[PDB]
């Protein structure tokens, strides 16, 4: 495996139709963790609940 390399995924927010509460997450763009709105569904590793996450990863 390469838990680095999710730093490098892309931004994917998830699908709008599922029933889960939408949350902040943060993803990494290769300059700065940037905050987006999670769906709570789907997504990639490329999505961190705290900013310090993203930055400890990426």
Same mark, same amino acid.
């Given at each position: 495996? $390469?838990?680095? =390399?999710?730093?490098?995924?892309?931004?994917?927010?998830?699908?709008?139709?599922?029933? %889960?509460?939408?949350?902040?997450?943060?993803?990494? $763009?290769?300059? =700065?963790?940037?905050?987006?709105?999670?769906?709570?569904?789907?997504?990639?590793?490329? %999505?961190?609940?705290?900013?310090?996450?993203?930055?400890?990863?990426?």
């Amino acid at each position: 495996a $390469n838990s680095k =390399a999710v730093c490098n995924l892309p931004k994917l927010a998830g699908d709008e139709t599922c029933s %889960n509460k939408t949350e902040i997450r943060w993803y990494y $763009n290769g300059t =700065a963790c940037e905050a987006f709105i999670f769906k709570g569904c789907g997504g990639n590793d490329n %999505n961190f609940d705290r900013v310090d996450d993203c930055q400890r990863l990426c």
